[PDB]
Amino acid sequence: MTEYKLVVVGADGVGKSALTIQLIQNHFVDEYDPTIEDSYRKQVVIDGETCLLDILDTAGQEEYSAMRDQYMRTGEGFLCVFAINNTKSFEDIHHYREQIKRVKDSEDVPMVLVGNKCDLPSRTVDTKQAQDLARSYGIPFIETSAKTRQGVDDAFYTLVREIRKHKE
Numbered sequence: 001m002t003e004y005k006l007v008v009v010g011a012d013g014v015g016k017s018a019l020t021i022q023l024i025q026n027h028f029v030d031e032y033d034p035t036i037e038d039s040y041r042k043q044v045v046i047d048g049e050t051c052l053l054d055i056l057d058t059a060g061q062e063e064y065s066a067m068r069d070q071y072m073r074t075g076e077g078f079l080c081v082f083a084i085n086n087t088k089s090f091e092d093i094h095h096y097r098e099q100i101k102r103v104k105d106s107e108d109v110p111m112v113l114v115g116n117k118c119d120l121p122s123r124t125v126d127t128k129q130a131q132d133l134a135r136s137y138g139i140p141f142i143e144t145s146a147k148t149r150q151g152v153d154d155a156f157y158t159l160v161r162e163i164r165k166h167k168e
């Protein structure tokens with residue numbers, strides 16, 4: 001079994017908890033306390049490899065310290081999540097990427113950009129806009145629905161594929 005330390009980052013309300021809880025418990029949670037940050041572990045097979053996924057679902061206040069720095073740099077891959085009906089969450093992605101790059105002290109950090117809530121009609125962030133920022137950073141882009149589970153497995157597996165590429 002290969003262990004893979006994944007961190008899900010992004011604004012409040014984008015569905016970081018819904019996405020984690022779908023992969024790991026296979027149900028959609030309408031309300032999950034927005035304050036609650038936790039690690040979830042799941043044994044899964046990805047491309048024939050048995051993996052233990054250790055997923056930090058981030059929450060809480062914007063609050064930089066040496067110990068939050070340490071905690072974040074143990075992530076091997078980051079799922080940078082925005083909601084397709086939340087322009088501000090999309091504009092925040094650069095920030096999250098910059099904090100990842102800083103605590104990793106590196107410009108090549110395994111990462112997937114995730115456009116969540118693709119089930120919703122009110123979309124303010126176009127696929128094309130997201131695709132453009134992805135190709136810019138050199139990372140995969142995937143649209144997801146924690147609600148229907150569209151793209152959820154693919155999102156997390158794609159990240160794992162990214163971690164493999166990075167360590168050949």
Ligand SMILES: C#Cc1c(F)ccc2cc(O)cc(-c3ncc4c(N5CCC[C@@](C)(O)C5)nc(OC[C@@]56CCCN5CC(=C(F)F)C6)nc4c3F)c12
Binds near residue numbers: 059060068091095
């Ligand atoms: C997230 C994150 C994070 C990493 F991804 C990597 C390394 C980090 C090292 C740290 O010491 C701290 C964090 C970290 N933790 C929380 C963080 C946090 N909160 C408030 C909203 C929800 C939450 C789950 O993101 C927790 N929020 C932000 O950015 C929020 C914005 C919006 C308000 C003003 N902020 C700066 C910004 C832009 F766009 F320039 C977005 N960063 C966090 C951060 F870097 C790191």
Ligand SMILES: Nc1nc2c(ncn2[C@@H]2O[C@H](COP(=O)(O)OP(=O)(O)NP(=O)(O)O)[C@@H](O)[C@H]2O)c(=O)[nH]1
Binds near residue numbers: 016030058060144146
């Ligand atoms: N329609 C729809 N609703 C979603 C989807 N994912 C999450 N939601 C909803 O959007 C809200 C936020 O979800 P949640 O997972 O709590 O967001 P979060 O990023 O985890 N916030 P936090 O930082 O507190 O953990 C909830 O009402 C949840 O039901 C999705 O793909 N589609």
